[PDB]
Design a protein around this ligand. Sequence first.
Ligand SMILES: [Cl-]
Ligand SMILES: [Cl-]
Ligand SMILES: [Cl-]
Ligand SMILES: [Cl-]
Ligand SMILES: [Cl-]
Length: 129
Amino acid sequence: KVFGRCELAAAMKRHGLDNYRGYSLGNWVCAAKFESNFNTQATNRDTDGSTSYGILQINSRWWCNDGRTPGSRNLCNIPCSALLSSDITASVNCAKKIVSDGNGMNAWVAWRNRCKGTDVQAWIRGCRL
Ligand SMILES: [Cl-]
Ligand SMILES: [Cl-]
Ligand SMILES: [Cl-]
Ligand SMILES: [Cl-]
Ligand SMILES: [Cl-]
């Protein structure tokens, strides 16, 4: 599924991401824009051999199981393929664990490089939320 911007904002808000660990909704929408372009089916291989999955590009080294990332963990207790669903529940639940891990949203490199410190409220502009 390719989410609309406001469509994703509403779903993220419903699932309790707005101000989760202090991060406003616009931070989460911005992260998803640059991680996946709002496409739930996005997958991208990383140089370490892991793969990142879904709307928030949750990675197989620590967070989900894909059976092909040696030495990895599955801390969200989920198959990585379950993060590609049109229903973002699994991705949100896993993102809550990631953002609680110690480094906040810096865990998403695209968030640090492209959203952090910017006018992230722009990402929810015009949305009836
Ligand atoms: Cl957009
Ligand atoms: Cl915001
Ligand atoms: Cl594995
Ligand atoms: Cl699995
Ligand atoms: Cl933080």
